Write an enzyme that holds these catalytic residues in place. Structure first.
Site, mmCIF file in Angstrom:
data_model
loop_
_atom_site.group_PDB
_atom_site.id
_atom_site.type_symbol
_atom_site.label_atom_id
_atom_site.label_comp_id
_atom_site.label_asym_id
_atom_site.label_seq_id
_atom_site.Cartn_x
_atom_site.Cartn_y
_atom_site.Cartn_z
ATOM 1 N N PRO A 1 0.814 -1.221 0.000
ATOM 2 C CA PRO A 1 0.000 0.000 0.000
ATOM 3 C C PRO A 1 0.851 1.277 0.000
ATOM 4 O O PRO A 1 1.859 1.380 0.706
ATOM 5 C CB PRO A 1 -0.834 -0.125 1.295
ATOM 6 C CG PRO A 1 -0.445 -1.510 1.893
ATOM 7 C CD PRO A 1 0.898 -1.821 1.335
ATOM 8 N N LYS A 32 -1.857 -5.383 5.622
ATOM 9 C CA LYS A 32 -0.494 -5.506 5.111
ATOM 10 C C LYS A 32 0.575 -5.123 6.135
ATOM 11 O O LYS A 32 0.362 -4.254 6.975
ATOM 12 C CB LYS A 32 -0.338 -4.654 3.850
ATOM 13 C CG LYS A 32 -1.281 -5.056 2.714
ATOM 14 C CD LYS A 32 -0.836 -6.354 2.058
ATOM 15 C CE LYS A 32 -1.988 -7.041 1.319
ATOM 16 N NZ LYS A 32 -1.546 -8.286 0.607
ATOM 17 N N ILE A 64 -2.467 -3.602 -3.766
ATOM 18 C CA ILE A 64 -2.730 -4.866 -4.430
ATOM 19 C C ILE A 64 -3.757 -5.606 -3.593
ATOM 20 O O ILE A 64 -3.431 -6.170 -2.551
ATOM 21 C CB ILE A 64 -1.460 -5.706 -4.591
ATOM 22 C CG1 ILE A 64 -0.444 -4.944 -5.448
ATOM 23 C CG2 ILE A 64 -1.800 -7.074 -5.173
ATOM 24 C CD1 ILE A 64 0.978 -5.478 -5.358
#
Ligand code: CL
EC number: 5.3.2.1
Lengths: 114, 114, 114
Positions: A1, A32, A64
């Site tokens: 990110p 994440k 993602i």
């Protein structure tokens, strides 16, 4: 990110530790690991929102995965909350563009995440 | 709609009122109220266009809908027009990236536009 | 093709000819004529990568075609290489966002590329 904020708020009004707070909060919110979270804050910008030069921000969040209707609502509450508390920007003068990236379309470390 | 212009033209060459003019004209072009329109101009950039550092601009227009082949041609004529007239940038040294965003992917006011 | 680099590396640490070098390398790598290539380098940025403020970079490559799994890997090796050698940035502190645009969504010269 990766999170980027562009704002017309002056450099001096960005508090010490703001980048680390953004990093931790984003690691938390997105799941994440913090080691790969990137953040970019750009003050002193020449901007208007609704024709007005009151404090505002234009932001983007690239990830993602971890992008979706419910998640994006949650990110905005988080990020607008931070911008209001730390930079004194009204949440209704903030836009955040959310990008769900394909791992093949993200380069890192001489390669990509594919 | 949010419009961002990055240019190597100096700050002093950005005329008074430019942000308001961009706001008004985007409102007209997109048919959206000026209250929703965000604009960001970034002068003094370190940029090259085609290996030359004559005046140039790299821009983006983010909109929830109102993006399409014909509409984007219309935006480019308008925005290149303004960049040439106001900033003296030749239209053939302007790139404008158009983004048709989903409402769920635009954060605003602690939520999204969904 | 447009390539943008945002970095916390100082301006004076950006070598003369870096824009020119970017332009030629990208021209060679994408097969596109140098006349069409735009490069934008943004130093001195308030950024963090993994919570750290060691040299790092957030980049994007926009192109009409010439974007895909294998291609993006080769771009990443090329550009991380250039960032490492010229800006002394570790490849593992670099993100590059790849955008494969439709010709209709890229404005230029009062029109689009469609
Ligand atoms: Cl979208």
């Amino acid at each position: 990110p990766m999170f980027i904020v562009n704002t017309n708020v002056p450099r001096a009004s960005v508090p010490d530790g703001f980048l680390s707070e953004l990093t931790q909060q984003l690691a938390q919110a997105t799941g994440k690991p913090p080691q790969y979270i990137a953040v970019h804050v750009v003050p002193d910008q020449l901007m208007a929102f609704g024709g007005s030069s009151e404090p505002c921000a234009l932001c983007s969040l690239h990830s993602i995965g971890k992008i979706g209707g419910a998640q994006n609502r949650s990110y905005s509450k988080l990020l607008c909350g931070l911008l209001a508390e730390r930079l004194r920007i009204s949440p209704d003068r903030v836009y955040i563009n959310y990008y769900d990236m394909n791992a093949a379309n993200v380069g890192w470390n001489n390669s990509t995440f594919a």
